[PDB]
mmCIF file of C-alpha atoms in Angstrom:
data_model
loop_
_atom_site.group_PDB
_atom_site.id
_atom_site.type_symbol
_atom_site.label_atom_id
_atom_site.label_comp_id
_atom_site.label_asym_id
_atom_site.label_seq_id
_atom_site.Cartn_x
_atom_site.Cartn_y
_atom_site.Cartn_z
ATOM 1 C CA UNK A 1 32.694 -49.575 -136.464
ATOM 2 C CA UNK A 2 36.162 -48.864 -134.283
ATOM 3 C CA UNK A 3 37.550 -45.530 -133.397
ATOM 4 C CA UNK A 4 41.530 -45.812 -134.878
ATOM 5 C CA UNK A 5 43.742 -42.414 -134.753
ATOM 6 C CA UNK A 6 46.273 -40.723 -132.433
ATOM 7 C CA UNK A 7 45.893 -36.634 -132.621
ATOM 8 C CA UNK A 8 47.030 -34.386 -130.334
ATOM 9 C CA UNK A 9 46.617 -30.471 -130.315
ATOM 10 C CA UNK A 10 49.680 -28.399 -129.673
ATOM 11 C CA UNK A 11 48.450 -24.964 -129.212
ATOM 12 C CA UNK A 12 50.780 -23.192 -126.740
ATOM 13 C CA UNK A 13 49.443 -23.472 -123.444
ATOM 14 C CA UNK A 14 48.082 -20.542 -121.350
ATOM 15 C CA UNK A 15 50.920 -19.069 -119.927
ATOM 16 C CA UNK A 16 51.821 -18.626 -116.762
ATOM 17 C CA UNK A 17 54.322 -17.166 -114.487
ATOM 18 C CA UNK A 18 56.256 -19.262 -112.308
ATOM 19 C CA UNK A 19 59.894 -16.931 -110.891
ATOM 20 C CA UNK A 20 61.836 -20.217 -110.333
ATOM 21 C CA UNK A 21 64.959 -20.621 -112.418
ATOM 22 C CA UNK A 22 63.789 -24.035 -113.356
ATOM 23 C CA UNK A 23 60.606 -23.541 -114.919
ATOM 24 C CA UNK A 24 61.132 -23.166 -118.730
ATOM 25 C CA UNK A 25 57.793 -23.231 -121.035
ATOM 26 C CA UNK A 26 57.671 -23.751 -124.513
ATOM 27 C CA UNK A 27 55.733 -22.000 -127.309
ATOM 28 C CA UNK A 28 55.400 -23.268 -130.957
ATOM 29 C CA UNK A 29 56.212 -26.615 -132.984
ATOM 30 C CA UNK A 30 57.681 -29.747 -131.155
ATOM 31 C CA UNK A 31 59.071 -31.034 -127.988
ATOM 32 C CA UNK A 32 62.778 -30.824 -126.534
ATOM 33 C CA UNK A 33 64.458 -33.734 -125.986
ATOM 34 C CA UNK A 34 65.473 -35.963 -122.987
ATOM 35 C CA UNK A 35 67.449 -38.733 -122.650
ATOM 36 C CA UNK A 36 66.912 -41.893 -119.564
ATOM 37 C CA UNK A 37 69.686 -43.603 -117.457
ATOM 38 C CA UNK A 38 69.460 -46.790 -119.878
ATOM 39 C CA UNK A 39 69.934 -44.425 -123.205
ATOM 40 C CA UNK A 40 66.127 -43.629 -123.837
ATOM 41 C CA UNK A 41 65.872 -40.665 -125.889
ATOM 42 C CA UNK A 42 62.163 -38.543 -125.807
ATOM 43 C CA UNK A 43 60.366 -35.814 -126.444
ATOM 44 C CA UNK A 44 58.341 -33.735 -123.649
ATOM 45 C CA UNK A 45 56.795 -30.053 -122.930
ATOM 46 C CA UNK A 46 57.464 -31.159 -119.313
ATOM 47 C CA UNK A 47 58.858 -27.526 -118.505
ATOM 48 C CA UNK A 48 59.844 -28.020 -114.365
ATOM 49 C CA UNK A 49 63.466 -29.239 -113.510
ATOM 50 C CA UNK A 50 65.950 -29.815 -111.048
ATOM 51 C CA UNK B 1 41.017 -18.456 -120.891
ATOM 52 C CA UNK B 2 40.411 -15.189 -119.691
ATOM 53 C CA UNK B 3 40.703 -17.222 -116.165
ATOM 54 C CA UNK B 4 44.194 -17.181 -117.103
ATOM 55 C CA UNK B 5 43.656 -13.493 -118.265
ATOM 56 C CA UNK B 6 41.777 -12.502 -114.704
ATOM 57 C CA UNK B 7 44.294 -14.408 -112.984
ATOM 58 C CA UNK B 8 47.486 -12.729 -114.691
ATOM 59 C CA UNK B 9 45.557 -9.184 -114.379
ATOM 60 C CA UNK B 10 45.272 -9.641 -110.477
ATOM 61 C CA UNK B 11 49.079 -10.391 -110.052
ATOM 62 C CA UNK B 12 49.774 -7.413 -111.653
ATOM 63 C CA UNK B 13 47.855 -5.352 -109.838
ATOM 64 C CA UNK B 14 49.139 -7.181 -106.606
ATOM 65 C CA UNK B 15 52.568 -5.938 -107.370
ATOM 66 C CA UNK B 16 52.163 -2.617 -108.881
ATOM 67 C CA UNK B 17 50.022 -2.724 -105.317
ATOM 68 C CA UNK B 18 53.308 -3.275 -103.686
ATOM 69 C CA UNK B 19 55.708 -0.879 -105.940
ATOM 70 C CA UNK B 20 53.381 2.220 -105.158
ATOM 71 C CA UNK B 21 53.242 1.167 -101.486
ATOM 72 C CA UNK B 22 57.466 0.393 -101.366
ATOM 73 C CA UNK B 23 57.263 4.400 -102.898
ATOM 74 C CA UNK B 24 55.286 5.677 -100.217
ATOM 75 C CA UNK B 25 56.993 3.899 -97.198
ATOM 76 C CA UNK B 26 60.592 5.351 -97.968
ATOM 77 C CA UNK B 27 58.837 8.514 -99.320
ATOM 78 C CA UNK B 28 61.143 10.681 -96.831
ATOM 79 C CA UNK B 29 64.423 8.662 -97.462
ATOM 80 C CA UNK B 30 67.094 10.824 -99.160
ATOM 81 C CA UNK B 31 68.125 9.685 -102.120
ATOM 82 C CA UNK B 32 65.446 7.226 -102.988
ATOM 83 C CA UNK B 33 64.467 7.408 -106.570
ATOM 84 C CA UNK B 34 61.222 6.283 -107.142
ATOM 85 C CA UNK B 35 60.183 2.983 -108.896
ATOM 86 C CA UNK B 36 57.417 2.036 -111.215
ATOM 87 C CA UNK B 37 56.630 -1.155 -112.724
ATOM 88 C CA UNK B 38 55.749 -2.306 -116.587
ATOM 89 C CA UNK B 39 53.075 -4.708 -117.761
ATOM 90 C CA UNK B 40 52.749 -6.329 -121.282
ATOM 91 C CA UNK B 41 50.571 -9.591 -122.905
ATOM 92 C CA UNK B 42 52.465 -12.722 -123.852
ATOM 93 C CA UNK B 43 53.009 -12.999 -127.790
ATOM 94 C CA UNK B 44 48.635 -14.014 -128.200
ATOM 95 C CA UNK B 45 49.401 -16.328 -130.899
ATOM 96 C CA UNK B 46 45.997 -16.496 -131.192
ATOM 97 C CA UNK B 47 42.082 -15.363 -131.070
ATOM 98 C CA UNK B 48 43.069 -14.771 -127.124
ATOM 99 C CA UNK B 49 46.445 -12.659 -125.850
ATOM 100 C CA UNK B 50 47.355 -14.523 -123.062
ATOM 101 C CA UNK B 51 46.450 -12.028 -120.368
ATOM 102 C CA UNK C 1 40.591 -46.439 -117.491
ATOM 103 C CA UNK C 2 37.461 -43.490 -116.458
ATOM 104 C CA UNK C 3 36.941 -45.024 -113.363
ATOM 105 C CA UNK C 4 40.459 -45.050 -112.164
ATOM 106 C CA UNK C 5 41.484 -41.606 -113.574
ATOM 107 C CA UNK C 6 38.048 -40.745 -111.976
ATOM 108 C CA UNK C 7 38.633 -41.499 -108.559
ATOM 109 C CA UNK C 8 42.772 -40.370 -108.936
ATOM 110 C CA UNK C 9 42.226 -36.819 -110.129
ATOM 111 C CA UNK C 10 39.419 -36.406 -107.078
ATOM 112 C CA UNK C 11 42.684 -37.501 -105.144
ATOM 113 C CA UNK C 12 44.959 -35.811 -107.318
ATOM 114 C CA UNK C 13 42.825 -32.275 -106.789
ATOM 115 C CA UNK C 14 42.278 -32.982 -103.070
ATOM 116 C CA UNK C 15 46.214 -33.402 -102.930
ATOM 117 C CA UNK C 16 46.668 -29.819 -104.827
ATOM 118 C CA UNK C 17 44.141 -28.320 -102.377
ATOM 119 C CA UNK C 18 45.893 -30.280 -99.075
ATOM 120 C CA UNK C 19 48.977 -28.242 -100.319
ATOM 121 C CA UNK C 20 47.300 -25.241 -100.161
ATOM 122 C CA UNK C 21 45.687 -26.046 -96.784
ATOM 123 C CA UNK C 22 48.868 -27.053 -95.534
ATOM 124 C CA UNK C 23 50.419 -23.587 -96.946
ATOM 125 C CA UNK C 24 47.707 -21.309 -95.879
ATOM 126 C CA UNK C 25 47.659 -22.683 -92.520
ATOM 127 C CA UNK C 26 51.401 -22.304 -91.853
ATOM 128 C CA UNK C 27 51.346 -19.040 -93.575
ATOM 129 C CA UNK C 28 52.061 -17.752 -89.602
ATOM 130 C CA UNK C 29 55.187 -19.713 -89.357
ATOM 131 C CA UNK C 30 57.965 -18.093 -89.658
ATOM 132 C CA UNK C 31 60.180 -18.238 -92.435
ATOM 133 C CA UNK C 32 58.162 -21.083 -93.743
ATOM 134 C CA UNK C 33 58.682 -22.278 -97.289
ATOM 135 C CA UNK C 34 55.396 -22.753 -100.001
ATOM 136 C CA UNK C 35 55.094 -26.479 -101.239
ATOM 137 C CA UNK C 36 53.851 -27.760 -104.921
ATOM 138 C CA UNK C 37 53.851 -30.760 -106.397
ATOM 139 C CA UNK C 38 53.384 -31.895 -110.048
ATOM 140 C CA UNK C 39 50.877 -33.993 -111.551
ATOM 141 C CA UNK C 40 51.175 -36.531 -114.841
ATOM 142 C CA UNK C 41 49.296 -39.197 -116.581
ATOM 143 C CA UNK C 42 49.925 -42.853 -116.746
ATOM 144 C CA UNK C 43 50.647 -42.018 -120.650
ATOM 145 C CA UNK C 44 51.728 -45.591 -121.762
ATOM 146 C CA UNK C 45 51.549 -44.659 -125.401
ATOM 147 C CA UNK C 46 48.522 -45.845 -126.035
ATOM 148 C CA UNK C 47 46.369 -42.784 -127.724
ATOM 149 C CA UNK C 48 46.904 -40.688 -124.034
ATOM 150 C CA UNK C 49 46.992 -42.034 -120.868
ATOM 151 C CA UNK C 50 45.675 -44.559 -118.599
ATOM 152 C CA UNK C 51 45.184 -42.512 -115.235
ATOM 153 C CA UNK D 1 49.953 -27.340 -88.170
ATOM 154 C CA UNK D 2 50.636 -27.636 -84.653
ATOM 155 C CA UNK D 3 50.104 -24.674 -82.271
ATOM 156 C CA UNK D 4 52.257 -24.838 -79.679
ATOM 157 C CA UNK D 5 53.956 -21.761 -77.361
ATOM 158 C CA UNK D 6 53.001 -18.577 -75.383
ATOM 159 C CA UNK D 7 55.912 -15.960 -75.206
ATOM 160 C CA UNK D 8 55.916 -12.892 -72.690
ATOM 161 C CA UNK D 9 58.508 -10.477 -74.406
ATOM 162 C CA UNK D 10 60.738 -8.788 -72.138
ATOM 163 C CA UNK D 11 61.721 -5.452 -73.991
ATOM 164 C CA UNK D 12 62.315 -2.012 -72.227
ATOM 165 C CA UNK D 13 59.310 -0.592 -70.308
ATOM 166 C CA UNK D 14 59.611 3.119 -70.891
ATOM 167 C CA UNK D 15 60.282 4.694 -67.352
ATOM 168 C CA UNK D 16 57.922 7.828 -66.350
ATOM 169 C CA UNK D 17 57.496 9.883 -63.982
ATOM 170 C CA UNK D 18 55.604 10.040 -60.657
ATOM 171 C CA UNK D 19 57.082 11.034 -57.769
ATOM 172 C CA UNK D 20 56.184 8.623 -54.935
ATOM 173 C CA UNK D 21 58.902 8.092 -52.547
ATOM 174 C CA UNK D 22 57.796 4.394 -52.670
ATOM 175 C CA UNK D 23 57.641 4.261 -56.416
ATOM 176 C CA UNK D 24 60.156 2.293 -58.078
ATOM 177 C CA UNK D 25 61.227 0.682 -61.395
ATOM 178 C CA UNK D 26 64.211 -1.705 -62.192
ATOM 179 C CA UNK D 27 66.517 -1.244 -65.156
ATOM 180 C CA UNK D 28 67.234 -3.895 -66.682
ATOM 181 C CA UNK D 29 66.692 -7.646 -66.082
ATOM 182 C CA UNK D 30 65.998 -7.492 -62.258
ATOM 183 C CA UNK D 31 62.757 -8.798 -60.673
ATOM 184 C CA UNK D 32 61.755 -8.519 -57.467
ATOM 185 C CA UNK D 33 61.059 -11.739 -54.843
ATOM 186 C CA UNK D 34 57.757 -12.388 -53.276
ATOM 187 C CA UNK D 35 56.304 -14.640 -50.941
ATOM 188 C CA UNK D 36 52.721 -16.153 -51.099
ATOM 189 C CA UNK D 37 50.350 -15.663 -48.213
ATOM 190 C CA UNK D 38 51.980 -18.228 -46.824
ATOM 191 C CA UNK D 39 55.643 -18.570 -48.286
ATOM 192 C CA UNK D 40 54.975 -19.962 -52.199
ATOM 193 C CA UNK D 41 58.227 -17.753 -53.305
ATOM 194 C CA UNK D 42 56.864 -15.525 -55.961
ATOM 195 C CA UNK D 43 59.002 -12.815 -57.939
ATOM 196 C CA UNK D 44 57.343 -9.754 -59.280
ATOM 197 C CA UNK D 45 58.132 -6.740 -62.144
ATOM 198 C CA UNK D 46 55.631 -4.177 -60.197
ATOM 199 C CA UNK D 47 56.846 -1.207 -59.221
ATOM 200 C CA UNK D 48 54.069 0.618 -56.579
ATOM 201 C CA UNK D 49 55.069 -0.348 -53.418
ATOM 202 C CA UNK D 50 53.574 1.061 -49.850
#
C-alpha cells in the first residue's frame, strides 16, 4: 500500500468580524489571485493586507 | 461552531451593551435622538448559520 | 514533519497568548494600541504543509 | 510592562469656610516655606496655622 491524493475542503470558513479596512474574507468557489516581485502568479484565501 | 456562534452572540450583546448605555448617559441632552443597534446571521450556507 | 509542527504551534499558540498577555497587561497605558500577528504553514506544495 | 511613576495632581482645592483668624488657603500655585527642626527647608500646602 501508499496513500497518493491531494484534497482539500473549501467550505467557507466561520466567519468572523475583524473592523479593519484590510481584512477581506471570502465565501464560495476559488481563490483570488496574487502576483510576486519575480512575476509569480497564485491563488490564496489569505484575506489580511497592507 | 457554535464557539464561533457563542463568540459572535457575546459581541453583540457587548455593543448593544454599549448603545443602551451611550442612550442613557446623554439621556438629558437636547436634541439627542436615540440610537439602537441591528443584528443579523451571516448567509449559513450550511447545516450551521454562522452565528 | 509532526514533531516540528508539534513543538511550533505550542510556540506558535504561546506567541498568540504572549500577545494577549502583553495587551491585557498594558490595557492601563494610555492610548496604547492592541497587537496581532498572523500565523501560516510551511505549505511547500507537497499535499499541505511541512510546519 | 514596566511600572514606573507616582503623580500628585495639583487641581483646585475647593476653598470653605471657617473663620479662624489664623486660617488660611492660597489660590493658586503658591506653597508655603518650612524649616525642619533644625533648618532642612521644607515647603508646605497646609493651611491651619497658630
Amino acid at each position: 500500500v501508499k496513500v497518493a491524493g491531494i484534497t482539500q475542503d473549501f467550505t467557507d470558513g466561520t466567519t468572523t468580524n475583524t473592523g479593519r479596512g484590510l481584512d477581506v474574507a471570502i465565501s464560495q468557489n476559488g481563490f483570488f489571485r496574487l502576483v510576486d516581485s519575480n512575476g509569480s502568479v497564485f491563488y490564496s484565501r489569505n484575506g489580511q493586507f497592507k | 461552531m457554535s464557539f464561533s456562534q457563542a463568540v459572535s452572540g457575546l459581541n453583540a450583546a457587548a455593543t448593544n451593551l454599549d448603545v443602551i448605555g451611550n442612550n442613557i448617559a446623554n439621556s438629558a441632552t437636547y436634541g439627542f435622538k436615540s440610537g439602537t443597534a441591528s443584528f443579523a446571521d451571516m448567509f449559513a450556507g450550511s447545516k450551521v448559520g454562522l452565528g
